[PDB]
Amino acid sequence: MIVILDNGGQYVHRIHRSLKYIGVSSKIVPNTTPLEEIESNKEVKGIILSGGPDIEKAKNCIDIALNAKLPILGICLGHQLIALAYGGEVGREEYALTKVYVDKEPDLFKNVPREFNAWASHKDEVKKVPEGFEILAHSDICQVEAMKHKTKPIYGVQFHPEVAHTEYGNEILKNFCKVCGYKFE
């Protein structure tokens, strides 16, 4: 089971819905839910940080990013949270298909073409990647469309693989759930 931290955004139901579609159980929890509570449930094999309108209403997500022992996928505000939590740079709203380019055969993008259209808003973005992170994807308007901690199962995407307008969105979720011990025949 995957725990989804409700950072207050519009597509949280969509994360739950899309995980169910590919065979993955998930529970939406208030974003104040303590890390200990999340990892004490032996059924939990990973954590998704959702999108949300305000970085300051999601500061619990910092302790989780720093200290969780489980895999983490941060989505939009979730990705920006992972970045600030590890000393990187976030900074400054409508939703559109963005052409994203994959950088160099990361697992996050197994079975995804080198280019694909991603449902994204760039209200904000990671301006500078934390030390010890690598960039996994970019576009013409955003240098950091996806990233990963080089030594930890911690993944960041600026876009919404949960929304069906994202090409291979369900393949990106499969690739992340693969890290949480799931197999997709």
From Swiss-Prot:
Entry GO MF terms: ATP binding; GMP synthase (glutamine-hydrolyzing) activity
Domain named Glutamine amidotransferase type-1: residues: 1-185
Superkingdom of origin organism: Archaea
Catalytic site: 76 (nucleophile), 160, 162
InterPro entries associated with the record: Class_I_gatase-like (IPR029062), GATASE (IPR017926), GMP_synth_GATase (IPR004739), GMP_synthase_A (IPR023686)
Keyword ATP-binding set for record: yes
Enzyme class: ligase
Catalytic activity, as annotated: XMP + L-glutamine + ATP + H2O = GMP + L-glutamate + AMP + diphosphate + 2 H(+)
Pathway where it operates: Purine metabolism; GMP biosynthesis; GMP from XMP (L-Gln route): step 1/1
The protein's Enzyme Commission number: 6.3.5.2
Keywords assigned by UniProt, alphabetized: ATP-binding, Glutamine amidotransferase, GMP biosynthesis, Ligase, Nucleotide-binding, Purine biosynthesis
UniProt-listed NCBIfam families: guaA_Nterm, PRK00758.1
Subunit structure: Heterodimer composed of a glutamine amidotransferase subunit (A) and a GMP-binding subunit (B).
PANTHER family: GMP SYNTHASE [GLUTAMINE-HYDROLYZING] (PTHR11922:SF2), GMP SYNTHASE-RELATED (PTHR11922)
Function of the molecule: Catalyzes the synthesis of GMP from XMP.
Protein name, per record: GMP synthase [glutamine-hydrolyzing] subunit A
Organism this protein belongs to: Methanocaldococcus jannaschii (strain ATCC 43067 / DSM 2661 / JAL-1 / JCM 10045 / NBRC 100440)
